[PDB]
Amino acid sequence: WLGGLSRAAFPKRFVFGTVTSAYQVEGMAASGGRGPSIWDAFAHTPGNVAGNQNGDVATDQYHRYKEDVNLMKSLNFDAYRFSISWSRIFPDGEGRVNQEGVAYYNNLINYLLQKGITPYVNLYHYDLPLALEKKYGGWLNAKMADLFTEYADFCFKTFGNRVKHWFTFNEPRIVALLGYDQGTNPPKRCTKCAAGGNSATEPYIVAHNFLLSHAAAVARYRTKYQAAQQGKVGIVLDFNWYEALSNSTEDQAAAQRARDFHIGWYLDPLINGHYPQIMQDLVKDRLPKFTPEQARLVKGSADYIGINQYTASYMKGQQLMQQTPTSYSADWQVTYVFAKNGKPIGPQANSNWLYIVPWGMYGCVNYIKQKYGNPTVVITENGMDQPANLSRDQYLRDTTRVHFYRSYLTQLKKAIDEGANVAGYFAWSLLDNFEWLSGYTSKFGIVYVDFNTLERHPKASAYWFRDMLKH
Numbered sequence: 001w002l003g004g005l006s007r008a009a010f011p012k013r014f015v016f017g018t019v020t021s022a023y024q025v026e027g028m029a030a031s032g033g034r035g036p037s038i039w040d041a042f043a044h045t046p047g048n049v050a051g052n053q054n055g056d057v058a059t060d061q062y063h064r065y066k067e068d069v070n071l072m073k074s075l076n077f078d079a080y081r082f083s084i085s086w087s088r089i090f091p092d093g094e095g096r097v098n099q100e101g102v103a104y105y106n107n108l109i110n111y112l113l114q115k116g117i118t119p120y121v122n123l124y125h126y127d128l129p130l131a132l133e134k135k136y137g138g139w140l141n142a143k144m145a146d147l148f149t150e151y152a153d154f155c156f157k158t159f160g161n162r163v164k165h166w167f168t169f170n171e172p173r174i175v176a177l178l179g180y181d182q183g184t185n186p187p188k189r190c191t192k193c194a195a196g197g198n199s200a201t202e203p204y205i206v207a208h209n210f211l212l213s214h215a216a217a218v219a220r221y222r223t224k225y226q227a228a229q230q231g232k233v234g235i236v237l238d239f240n241w242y243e244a245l246s247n248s249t250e251d252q253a254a255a256q257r258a259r260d261f262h263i264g265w266y267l268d269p270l271i272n273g274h275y276p277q278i279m280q281d282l283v284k285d286r287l288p289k290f291t292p293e294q295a296r297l298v299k300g301s302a303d304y305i306g307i308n309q310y311t312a313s314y315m316k317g318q319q320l321m322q323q324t325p326t327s328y329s330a331d332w333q334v335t336y337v338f339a340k341n342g343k344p345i346g347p348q349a350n351s352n353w354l355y356i357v358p359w360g361m362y363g364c365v366n367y368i369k370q371k372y373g374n375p376t377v378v379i380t381e382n383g384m385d386q387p388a389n390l391s392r393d394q395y396l397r398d399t400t401r402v403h404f405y406r407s408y409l410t411q412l413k414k415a416i417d418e419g420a421n422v423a424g425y426f427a428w429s430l431l432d433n434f435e436w437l438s439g440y441t442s443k444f445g446i447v448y449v450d451f452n453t454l455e456r457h458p459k460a461s462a463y464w465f466r467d468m469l470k471h
C-alpha cells in the first residue's frame with residue numbers, strides 16, 4: 001500500500017495537488033460566451049481525434065466544479081492546478097471581455113479557497129483562441145508577446161488578489177514539436193503538411209516566442225502587480241528522462257544532447273539567459289538569437305519551474321554529422337532505444353509513449369538540481385493511463401496506477417532527500433478526461449468519470465492518496 005510514504009516523508013509544507021486543464025475537463029466549449037480555440041476547430045474535423053470526439057462536454061466540470069472540489073478536499077490534497085481558457089475570457093483573444101467566463105473562474109477560485117484548496121493557475125494550456133491563429137498566425141508571430149501579456153495582465157488584475165501561484169505556459173516544447181515539426185497537433189504545420197510549414201525552422205520560431213511572451217508577462221506582473229499581490233509566476237515544461245544506452249563517450253554524449261534539446265531548450269534561457277551551446281552549434285542560424293536585453297528579461301523570469309514528468313528512454317549515439325536540416329527532431333542526431341541488456345526500460349501504460357520507469361523521476365529531478373543551480377521545482381504533472389472499454393469496476397481497481405504513484409513518489413522522495421529543491425507534486429489527473437488525440441479512449445484520472453452519465457467514482461489510487469496524505 002503506502003510503502004512508508006506519508007506527509008511526514010516529505011518536507012514540511014510540501015504541496016500535494018491534482019491537475020486538470022480547461023479544454024480537457026470544463027465542457028461548455030461553445031457556451032457561456034466562450035469563443036473557439038484552435039483545439040475546438042481541430043477536434044471538430046472528422047478523423048482528427050479518436051472516435052471524432054471533442055471537448056464540447058468533456059467532464060462538464062463547468063457545472064460540477066463544487067462536486068469536484070469537495071472530492072479533492074475529501075482526498076486530502078492541498079492544491080489544485082487548473083487552467084484558464086483564454087477564449088472563455090476573451091472570445092477573440094483580444095478586445096471584448098466575456099463577463100460570464102470571468103464569473104466562472106471567480107466562482108471556482110472562491111470555492112477552492114473556501115474549501116482550503118490552493119489554486120495553482122495556468123494561463124495557457126494548448127488552447128490559443130482561434131481568432132488569434134487566423135488573424136496573427138499564432139505562435140509564429142512575435143506579436144504574441146504583447147497579446148499574451150495583455151491577457152495575462154487582465155487575469156492578474158481580476159484574480160491575482162486571490163491567486164498567488166501562476167503558470168504562464170504548459171509544455172511549449174510539445175506545441176513546437178507536434179504543431180510545427182510533426183504537424184500532428186494544431187495548427188498541423190510541417191514541411192510536407194497541407195497547412196504549410198517547415199519542420200526545420202518553425203519549431204524554433206515558436207519556442208522563442210513562448211520564451212519572449214513568458215518574459216514579457218512576468219515583467220508586467222513584477223512591475224505592476226507583485227507589490228500589492230505578492231504572488232509568483234512560473235512556467236510548465238515537459239521533461240522525460242534520457243539515459244545513455246552504454247557508458248561509451250558517444251552514447252553519453254547522445255543522452256546529453258537529448259536532455260539539452262528537450263529541457264535545456266527552455267531551462268538554459270530561463271536560468272542562464274542563453275540557449276544550450278549544443279543547440280547553438282547544431283541549429284546555427286535556424287535558432288533565433290536573444291538580444292542582450294531580451295536574454296536579461298528571460299533570465300530569472302520564472303519563480304519556480306513546473307516539470308511534467310512521465311517516462312524515460314535509452315539513448316544511443318553516433319558520430320556528429322554535417323547534415324542538410326530537415327527538422328527539430330533530426331537536429332538532435334540521436335537514436336532512441338527502448339531496450340538495454342535484452343530488457344525493456346519499462347512496461348507501457350495505455351499510451352504507447354508512456355513507459356513506466358520510476359527511476360526517470362529521480363533522473364530528471366537530480367539532473368535539474370545538479371545542472372541548473374537547484375532551482376525551485378514543482379512536479380506539475382505525473383500519472384499514467386488505462387485503456388478504453390473497461391467496466392466501471394475495472395477502472396476502479398487501478399492497482400497499476402497505485403504501484404505507479406508509490407514507485408514514482410519514492411523516487412521523487414529519494415531526490416528530495418538528496419537535496420533537490422522540490423516544492424510540490426501534482427497528479428495528472430484528478431479526473432478521466434479528454435486526452436487530446438486519444439479523446440476519451442485514454443483514462444488518466446485517480447477519479448473515474450462515466451462519460452455516459454458524467455458520474456464521478458474515486459479509484460483505488462484516489463483512496464491511496466487519501467490514506468497517504470492524511471493530516
Ligand SMILES: [Zn+2]
Nearest residue numbers: 060062063064
Ligand atoms: Zn452541464
